[PDB]
């Protein structure tokens with residue numbers, strides 16, 4: 001929920017650590033429509 | 049890759065990653081019943097998540 005994302009060439013990098021992630025709230029708070037993942041399935045992301 | 053890749057991309061060989069339980073040994077799953085990962089029920093040809 002940023003005010004605005006960066007440009008494609010000055011692409012904005014940010015590391016996430018020392019914290020618990022839930023991708024369920026990541027989508028459920030805010031509707032969206034593009035999604036594709038390699039090396040993992042969108043469900044199994046929740047526990048590895 | 050010589051005999052079976054395609055210049056436009058060989059999309060023929062398909063595989064499954066979404067199933068309720070793990071595949072049992074000496075068994076094959078040809079079924080393509082729309083699987084649902086999302087919290088709400090999904091139906092028809094497709095559903096969200």
Ligand SMILES: *[C@@H]1O[C@H](CO)[C@@H](O)[C@H](O)[C@H]1NC(C)=O
Pocket residue numbers: 001029030
């Ligand atoms: C994003 O943050 C704003 C406040 O800056 C808030 O009003 C808004 O509800 C947030 N987004 C969502 C989808 O809740």
